[PDB]
């Protein structure tokens, strides 16, 4: 609907941010991309449908590559080394009010704050516990 706009995925505080802008929405798959390249842009995909008699399911996927620069001859061609994926699902009952939805969003926000254990474990390349 009116939520198909652009936003900053990575925020480095200044000119280092990475903005994704709307690209496509067909077959029920919203697709934001960073740049019109094929293998160098951060990619965000989203969709929503009804899953059960009383639930809805929103599914979200993110792809974050690592970019390098390998030169053959003297062309200086930029390339992608590897990609890191993400698959987020979210089941929400139909008759949930608005405040319940901000509660869910607040839970997801606070789970990934800087000082929390799970993001620190992800960032330090260690194991849980």
Phi, psi of 103 (to 5 degrees): -65, -45
Site for a copy of itself in 72-111 (CB under 8 A): 81-96, 98, 100-111
Measured at the CA of 62, the angle between CA 20 and CA 126, to 5 degrees, comes to 125
Measured at the CA of 113, the angle between CA 112 and CA 119, to 5 degrees, comes to 50
Residue 74 DSSP class: T
Smallest separation (angstroms) from a copy of itself to the CB of 95: 6
For residues 58 and 92, the answer to whether their CB atoms sit within 8 Å is: yes
Residue 27 DSSP class: T
Binding to a copy of itself by CB under 8 A, coded x per residue (else -) over 1-40, reads x-xxx-xxxxxx-----x------xxxx-x----------
Among 14, 73, 74, 115, binds a copy of itself (CB under 8 A): 115
3-state secondary structure of 73: coil
Site for a copy of itself in 41-70 (CB under 8 A): 42, 44, 46-54, 56-58, 60, 62, 64, 66
Residue 73 vs 82, nearer CB to a copy of itself: 82
Smallest separation (angstroms) from a copy of itself to the CB of 15: 15
Smallest separation (angstroms) from a copy of itself to the CB of 45: 10
């Amino acid at each position: 609907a009116s939520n198909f706009t652009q936003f900053v995925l990575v925020d480095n505080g200044g000119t280092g941010d990475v903005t994704v802008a709307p690209s496509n929405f067909a077959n029920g798959v919203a697709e934001w991309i960073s740049s019109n390249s094929r293998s160098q842009a951060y990619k965000v995909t989203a969709s929503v449908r009804q899953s059960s008699a009383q639930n809805r399911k929103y599914t979200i996927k993110v792809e974050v590559p690592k970019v390098a620069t390998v030169t053959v001859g003297g062309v200086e061609l930029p390339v992608a080394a590897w990609r890191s994926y993400l698959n987020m699902e979210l089941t929400i009952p139909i008759f949930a009010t608005n405040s319940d939805c901000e509660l869910i969003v607040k839970a997801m926000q606070g789970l990934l704050k800087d000082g929390n254990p799970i993001p620190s474990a992800i960032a330090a390349n260690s194991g849980i516990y």
